[PDB]
Amino acid sequence: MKIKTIKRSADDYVPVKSTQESQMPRNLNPELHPFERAREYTKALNATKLERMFAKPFVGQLGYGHRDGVYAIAKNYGSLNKLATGSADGVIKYWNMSTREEFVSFKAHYGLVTGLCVTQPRFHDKKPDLKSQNFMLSCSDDKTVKLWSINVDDYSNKNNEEGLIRTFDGESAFQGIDSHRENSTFATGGAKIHLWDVNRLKPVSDLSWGADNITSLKFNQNETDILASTGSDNSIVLYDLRTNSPTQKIVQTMRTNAICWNPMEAFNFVTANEDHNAYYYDMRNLSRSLNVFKDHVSAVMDVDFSPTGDEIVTGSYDKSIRIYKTNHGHSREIYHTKRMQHVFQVKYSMDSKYIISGSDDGNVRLWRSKAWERSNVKTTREKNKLEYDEKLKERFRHMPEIKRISRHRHVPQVIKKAQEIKNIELSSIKRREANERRTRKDMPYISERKKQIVGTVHKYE
Template identity: 35%
Template sequence: MRRRQNCPATVFSGARDGLVNDISVDNNNGENFLTVGQDAQLKYWKISSVVESQQKTPAHSIAIDGIVYGVSHLSFSSDFVTCGEDISVWKPFRETPLRSYNLGTDTIHACRANPIEENVIVGCRSDRSIFVLDTRQDVPLKKVQMEAYSFTVAIEDFSLYTFDMRYMEHPVQSHQGFTSAVLDVDYSPTGQEFVAAGYDRSIRLFKARDMTSRDVYYTKRMASVLSVLWSADSKFVLSGSNEMNIRVWKANAAEKLGPLTKREKQAFAYNEKLRETYKNHPDVRRIAKHRNVPRHIFTAAKEHKLIRDARARRDLRRAKAQGLDEEESYLPQTQKVMLGDAKM
């Protein structure tokens, strides 16, 4: 692996044998990071303050039984969790996990630690189920008694669903707009917005409680987007796509980068207030929500709308044939998507 000569960065070359499945930076001091991959090893790497050309050997490595698909550090801690055949909680440089959770025979493909509640972990399995864990307990959670926290999952039915940990019977909101499978999702540091990556070669930015996206980003040569990340300063969004490119986007497309004068700040604030005041005016709403999208997305969205309308008419006719009224026959999308609540 080669880096540009004028790029002041350390390159970790030959870091692993096989694919790197996940990476996580120490939340306590920010001086180390971990990688897991297909070689069934957990590797510690040192982030040096001195710029080096290459770093080929890790500071420490641990052999693990089975392949690990995800790793995530706990909030404000050097402890971390890994997922694969089970969920394991680790102490730094410890050869064996501190605690393990066996959630069944299905592979756990992703796990993330809650950035606010430091002991809460959420993850997803290959049987299309999601789970919530508290590292202080021995069994998975279904409810959080004191305060609600939300999390969002990306699903192959072209949608995302936001859940409340206290009430897991069905999602509290569905987020739509993609025309193909949704592959990744990441929240902004504020927790009020999130970004999602789609197989339809676009990324979309959603407000946490809105059904439709507030913005959609794409380029002519960008392939399917596999991963997205919201920067810690909430200013930028990073995307990794299938043609092996990383792109940096502005989280607010109209925001000016760099220092602003006092008059510029006042002008931006005034314009934002005008948009907020008149956002429900038909013409203002039409302009604010309009987004130019590629032809393949426009055509697929039009086709999906025809399919949804046809299904709605079919369900209405079926309800009338059974003697039900429209209100009794209507079932929200957030309830249609849930198959059941598995007992662990």
């Protein structure tokens, strides 16, 4: 009779030399591993609880802030850690966000500096030294656009006349500014929107639809010759710089405070307006928004895109900011602070990992876009654990017990009470429109994505 038993042999399972690790034999039988749904449910629940205890999003404020509340912010789209901010008392500052300290400050204007951006100024007589000088220009309500250079310690190649290399001049005030991402060009909105270049001391072209003023401006990031602007007649106007002309405008219900273009989709933009939500619009069809981001409770002051194009940040007049996944339409996250008042400017840093907010008490604050995410480099075991936990929270996302935990935040008292009376108001109007629809004959079902456009020039067929 042949016969054979289990010969475990102890050389394959506990190692000979003491310096090396023990063997881990695997056996992928589901008989060996029994509770495959419950075990990863509890791992997804422990991941959501670990996220809710690791959510420490406030990095730090930078510097000492300003004196009179930050109303303009501009990142530069080529360096990771440099940031220009301007306040109401005319002072602008250039910031190193690594050390959280200003390269330089500038008493730029006398009024409010109402816009500022950054440039690589293509002069055709001089050569731009972009490895030691940074350039920011800035418009105010004292009818001036000024262009400044900054001494920057980022390369150590060299070894110098920092401020105010030139002063463009308008006859009326300015209200917004944004620079083209090539070809020495910028545009300033104000009493009317002008286009400029850094060589000529006067506007190249006036590109105004009608005699109604312009409140904001953004250039496109790819297809760089497409401008967009917000006018105080609740209007959003697109301009093209091939045709050197406006292109199409829409009139909404309330006033668009800001625009930002999608850096990864080149025809989509997001508007941030005074009814308390944001609108994701396609340039090729402005007859309908392709999303509405709804969760704010007062007027949305500024919006910005992640450089990955996958989520937006959105600061509003209720003293809180909100981060939104682009495909959802409700807030993924809310950041607030008892010290932060009336966040007027929000940018999304080029790392896609930090969020810069300028409030109006004076302070500019860094936040993490993902609160539970730390910025060290990770060994492969902890990186694998973190993305395993992300995939697991993703596929158990809608279970009631982990949804009530991942959904949870502490919102201030004012925003919570405004939220619940907003809920009972919306439920009341849905009740009344359901009754009215039960009776009356032809009540059209208007979409939420169309419920906020009062009209559109150049009708669609």
